[PDB]
Ligand binder design. Sequence first.
Ligand code: NAD
Ligand code: NAD
Ligand code: NAD
Ligand code: NAD
Ligand code: D4A
Ligand code: D4A
Ligand code: D4A
Ligand code: D4A
Lengths: 324, 324, 331, 322
Amino acid sequence: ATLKDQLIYNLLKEEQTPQNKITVVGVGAVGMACAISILMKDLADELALVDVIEDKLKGEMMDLQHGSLFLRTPKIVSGKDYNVTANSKLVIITAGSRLNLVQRNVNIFKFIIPNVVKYSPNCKLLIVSNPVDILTYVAWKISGFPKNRVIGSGCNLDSARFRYLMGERLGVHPLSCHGWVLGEHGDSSVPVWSGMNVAGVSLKTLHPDLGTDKDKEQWKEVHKQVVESAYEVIKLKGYTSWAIGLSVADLAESIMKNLRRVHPVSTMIKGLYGIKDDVFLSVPCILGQNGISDLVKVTLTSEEEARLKKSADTLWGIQKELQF
Amino acid sequence: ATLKDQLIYNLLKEEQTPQNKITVVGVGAVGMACAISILMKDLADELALVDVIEDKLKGEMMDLQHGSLFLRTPKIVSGKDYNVTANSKLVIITAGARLNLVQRNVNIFKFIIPNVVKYSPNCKLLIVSNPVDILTYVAWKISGFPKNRVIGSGCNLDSARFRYLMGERLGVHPLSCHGWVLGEHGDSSVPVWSGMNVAGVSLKTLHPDLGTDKDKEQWKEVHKQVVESAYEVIKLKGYTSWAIGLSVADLAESIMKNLRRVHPVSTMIKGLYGIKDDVFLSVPCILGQNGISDLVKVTLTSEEEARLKKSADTLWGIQKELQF
Amino acid sequence: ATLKDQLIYNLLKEEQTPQNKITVVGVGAVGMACAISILMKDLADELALVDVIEDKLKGEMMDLQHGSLFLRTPKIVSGKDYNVTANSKLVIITAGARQQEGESRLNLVQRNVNIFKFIIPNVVKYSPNCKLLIVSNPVDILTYVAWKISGFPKNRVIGSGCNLDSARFRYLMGERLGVHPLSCHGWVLGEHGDSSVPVWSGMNVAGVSLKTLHPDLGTDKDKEQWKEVHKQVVESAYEVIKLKGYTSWAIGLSVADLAESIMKNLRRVHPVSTMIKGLYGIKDDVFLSVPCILGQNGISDLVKVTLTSEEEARLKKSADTLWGIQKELQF
Amino acid sequence: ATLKDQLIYNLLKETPQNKITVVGVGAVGMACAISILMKDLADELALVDVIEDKLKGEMMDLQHGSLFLRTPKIVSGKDYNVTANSKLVIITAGARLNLVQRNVNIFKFIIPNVVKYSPNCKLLIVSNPVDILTYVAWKISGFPKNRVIGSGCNLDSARFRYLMGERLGVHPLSCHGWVLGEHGDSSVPVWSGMNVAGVSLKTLHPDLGTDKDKEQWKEVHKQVVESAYEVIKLKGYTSWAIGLSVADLAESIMKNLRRVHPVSTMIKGLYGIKDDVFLSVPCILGQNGISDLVKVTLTSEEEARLKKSADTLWGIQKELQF
Ligand SMILES: NC(=O)c1ccc[n+]([C@@H]2O[C@H](COP(=O)([O-])OP(=O)(O)OC[C@H]3O[C@@H](n4cnc5c(N)ncnc54)[C@H](O)[C@@H]3O)[C@@H](O)[C@H]2O)c1
Ligand SMILES: NC(=O)c1ccc[n+]([C@@H]2O[C@H](COP(=O)([O-])OP(=O)(O)OC[C@H]3O[C@@H](n4cnc5c(N)ncnc54)[C@H](O)[C@@H]3O)[C@@H](O)[C@H]2O)c1
Ligand SMILES: NC(=O)c1ccc[n+]([C@@H]2O[C@H](COP(=O)([O-])OP(=O)(O)OC[C@H]3O[C@@H](n4cnc5c(N)ncnc54)[C@H](O)[C@@H]3O)[C@@H](O)[C@H]2O)c1
Ligand SMILES: NC(=O)c1ccc[n+]([C@@H]2O[C@H](COP(=O)([O-])OP(=O)(O)OC[C@H]3O[C@@H](n4cnc5c(N)ncnc54)[C@H](O)[C@@H]3O)[C@@H](O)[C@H]2O)c1
Ligand SMILES: O=C1O[C@](c2ccsc2)(c2cccc(Nc3ccc(F)cc3)n2)CC(O)=C1Sc1ccccc1Cl
Ligand SMILES: O=C1O[C@](c2ccsc2)(c2cccc(Nc3ccc(F)cc3)n2)CC(O)=C1Sc1ccccc1Cl
Ligand SMILES: O=C1O[C@](c2ccsc2)(c2cccc(Nc3ccc(F)cc3)n2)CC(O)=C1Sc1ccccc1Cl
Ligand SMILES: O=C1O[C@](c2ccsc2)(c2cccc(Nc3ccc(F)cc3)n2)CC(O)=C1Sc1ccccc1Cl
């Protein structure tokens, strides 16, 4: 008899399928930051990692496994083959001319998405890879999943950055500074000035010129500084990781724990704000065990509405010319 | 007249000193992994980051600040000047070249350590930079701090790796697999076979060949795999970050919360195991608000004791020829 | 040599003053619920418990100490003497005397004022630099009492106030909309309890004002009867008392949320009772709930909420009633 | 159109994934509830009792604290339909041979109602005499022994490690020690396993656990027994310590951690014990309940104490009607 048999008496060997499994596809700076944030928040009983670079994939898995003593995630697996991702509740995609840069990530998705749906037909897909709004659509089209199970990170990072900048200007914690950046993720995002508040006190009600070019204090600059901070981080360190990883982990917690919290995420915006094309844009969504179960119908000004419609037309102009 | 003044009525604007401040010196792969693990564990009310590369430093600080909405650390500061580190309770040194490593790192410590003690004379110093055992001694000599306030990461990562491997062989969580790797961090570490247990059941008592060359089960391979895995991770991804960052955060928690938990850390071992020189080696230490307040006197075999004495002689041989 | 000396080599035996100490005064249902919430949220390196009933006090301390293996608070102390509370960063007062049928509201206040005139001087004696968090009812009057007896600046005297009222309101709001209360924003202000004021204009989800979409929100003409959401806050409080005899978990969790902002210097906004003199036409030394920024100095700042004239009149009426009792208080 | 419909556009209006049920909302039950809620172990918490008013009050009080919790649904009821598809069921209902039979009659109604709605659950028995009632739950349910867990010596060990920690000035997490066998007065401290950093205390101090010992380390176990009576005399019941220990068990089960805990299990087949009795041994706890057990090397004296406890428990068990 072995030491294991001399020390431990086994009652049953009958192993079960993972109950709260998360898969992260792409183990770059974003993927690894999502991985550590998820592990530290104790959201999964199993974590699966996938990439094309075999050596860095094995190294990253081993480095996470060596930290098991300080974690509450008993199983960390990795592999090039998607059989390691079987029965995942949530799949996070962070793998990465502009129409050709869209097609560059599109042909990458032509392989990933069918391999993901094959082993986890009932999962929720969380898209992080850029252009997030186009690639969420691509993931939705290739998977054949209903709209609720295909979620784009969208304006989650934009809103988090906005609330941080809002907090700094008012000397208040970002948790107490409410503000929504919607529509197209990145440069063309829309700050919803009417909803910007502290303790239910509307900033536009107190300051009617809020976000307008004629505002003396220039509060519009809070949104400008979101765009500019993103370029600054890239210029200074070459990439963004911690902020995105923490925001993705926040989305994952709502999904995994079925919290039904409202988050600014990219969803099929068809039928809203005069949009008829199959486009994904950020609106506040209620997140839970079925993914996007509901969405908040935000009252937008004519100007905000026009910006959303223009973004939709631009995204459908690229999407129209895509090979599947 | 401002929106801030119209929205917020100020009661007082006297500034207080941070109560639970942590400083991380060196924002490389190790330093950043320590930062994120401390942030996600809510150990500090303020986090300061220091480095020589200004661009990378600003980028890393900004990336952490953009994630504030998902954290409970209201202040994140960075700078080349140590005035940003003022009144830190714990200072974590992860700087240097990732023996010539000794030479380069001593010279680097010659300037870091006096700048640290200048702004935080009452802090605890936690050394991560390699060779961790020599550099903990160097930090102790330059600072002039008492023994208890100078802590080396030492065999904390070695023991965590060992318990992970132990857990995998027995099908038990590493938290329930007890085992101590002591002495010199790295290649020359000592596994304490007599203390290896599950639920107080000694493994060497059940299996006398444990750790011997005549063991058919080859349990001696468990300690060799700790050494092998470290080289494998480096070969595969180029560095180690997550495992070390999580282990350092576990030490930080015991210090910050005054837990008085026992950890394998590098301390002044002069007066134990026939050692008469000023050398730092890993032994189980009680960690709290005063740093190392106490140490556990582990009963070692003649073989284990000889390995510790040999390590001490080698470390002193390098140390006695160093210039301060 | 002892087993301890044979096993452990001591480097230094000197113990530092506690760094993040919390004291809970009154170990009744509320106090104990505040204690377990603070312990489970790891907000303190030291927890001190005080009461007048020595046996119950020792029992409660021992029961908490027996759970130390599952906690991250290395020291739990208790005692009748306030020397156990020395150097506390935050002192939570939950000591009180319940409502007795056949007494005036002034008489009820005075009995609790009698309880405080021993506690407050003993608290400031051992923790002159602490923050005082008052839970005992009538919370608005007793926060004033604590402020007057202590001699502390306004920022270091905090009343629980409308923190439980808002938490209850947001739960009920969440239920109606099928959304988590964290995402359902709403503020109940003024006097804690029966006379609280729901601020309809601030009620929102994702920055979308409910009053803007539905102008009859909080009006008696409302077809959807959203005004009954605030009435259910009042009703649920009486229902809980009728059903189990007291309230503990909800208040303990809300107090822990306040403690977290103070202990960690978060600067989060909370509806807490503060010295409202100089706002909403209130010219008296009264404590009412308004949204306050809470940190290491207690209330460092307050949010100037725009109120309708009827919300302002309700606040002024509450202030007059509280001052009417306060002026007749002997201490 | 309602305000809800004007504000929120519904995509779909389509069961609990990590549900926990607590049976008996007394001091123990409520302490288990708050500990589980604060540890974020369940997405749904179901509460059951016979006293309808107290039950509704306790459920409401927990619901009013939702803003500070990460458990979106708290339900209660006299009917067990509220407990449907629970992953873990915690039984805390009961009196704080004649009395044992009255507690069997209570379990004759609870246990069939629990398995009816949660046939795949893990049963965690807290109610006293915990070792006898664990057997009772196992017999009535028909569940395999891995899915019937008794709290057993989990509180005894926690108390012991606290007392060990106080004597050595070390955190109980770093003070290892196992109290096994029968929960309560007749528990067995395993002196050979008592250690700090893998350093055996019995090796350094041979008199450890004997009357001869000048340092009287045997009092560490005797003060566990004494403290239990003291807490009862002082406050009338024990709640926080037991509630925190149950949440610790619940965490290893819910998250499939495979951590070792001192819990009551079917001990028949070990230490010459032939009768169907449940005693505490270190068990590996996970998603299947007790998947494995640690075979502790016990001295002749310790082994005899377990066998004697088994004979006493069987003596009571054989005379039971159910
Ligand atoms: N949505 C947001 O707010 C947001 C924020 C930041 C970054 N991003 C995006 O996230 C993406 C990842 O950024 P990063 O810095 O981690 O990039 P990176 O180059 O560091 O990592 C990309 C990883 O994807 C892997 N990969 C490539 N092809 C793959 C395939 N076919 N299958 C699996 N893995 C594959 C690569 O091997 C690499 O490890 C980028 O598209 C970036 O624009 C989005
Ligand atoms: N103790 C352990 O168990 C353990 C484990 C892993 C790594 N390490 C050690 O940690 C150290 C850091 O590793 P890494 O991978 O982060 O290296 P890295 O090169 O990625 O980062 C080192 C950082 O230190 C900075 N630095 C250099 N000189 C500095 C100075 N004078 N002041 C401040 N910052 C300065 C560099 O700018 C760089 O950002 C290495 O010495 C490595 O051997 C120790
Ligand atoms: N602010 C709120 O929202 C809110 C909510 C619920 C309850 N409360 C209030 O909290 C208070 C406590 O409620 P409870 O149910 O715990 O009451 P309780 O009677 O159960 O507990 C009161 C405790 O205070 C102790 N005490 C009495 N005099 C004391 C003294 N001089 N020094 C120290 N301790 C002393 C008593 O011994 C008792 O243990 C009540 O006043 C209640 O109205 C406030
Ligand atoms: N295992 C341990 O280490 C340990 C520790 C402490 C207490 N306990 C035991 O836990 C049990 C509970 O103690 P307590 O202080 O909470 O008791 P309590 O009297 O405060 O609570 C018991 C609850 O069970 C309820 N109940 C009674 N019959 C019921 C039924 N048929 N169905 C559902 N609920 C029913 C009662 O209504 C009451 O609410 C006691 O048996 C006690 O001995 C065990
Ligand atoms: O912080 C970020 O870094 C990235 C990045 C770049 C390299 S590595 C990470 C980045 C940074 C700067 C510009 C840029 N242009 C871009 C974005 C999406 C596309 F499809 C194509 C180009 N992209 C990716 C990303 O989306 C953000 S967020 C963000 C980005 C812009 C404004 C506001 C916000 Cl909030
Ligand atoms: O995993 C690690 O990564 C490093 C690393 C990080 C970035 S480049 C290298 C590494 C990995 C492999 C070997 C090596 N040799 C070394 C260690 C300490 C010195 F002073 C000098 C050289 N160093 C550093 C480090 O100490 C560890 S731990 C460890 C290391 C060796 C054996 C066991 C363990 Cl546990
Ligand atoms: O839920 C509660 O329970 C109490 C309680 C706790 C233990 S016995 C009573 C309660 C419940 C009902 C009435 C009442 N009146 C009272 C209590 C003590 C005084 F000195 C003065 C007045 N007090 C105390 C309390 O303030 C709340 S909150 C609340 C209360 C009313 C409306 C809205 C809210 Cl939100
Ligand atoms: O601390 C406790 O409180 C109780 C309690 C709870 C509410 S009223 C009493 C208690 C305390 C004292 C005696 C007793 N009689 C009893 C316990 C177990 C049986 F099987 C049968 C009868 N019961 C219940 C309990 O089990 C413990 S633990 C414990 C108990 C004794 C020794 C060691 C430990 Cl650790």
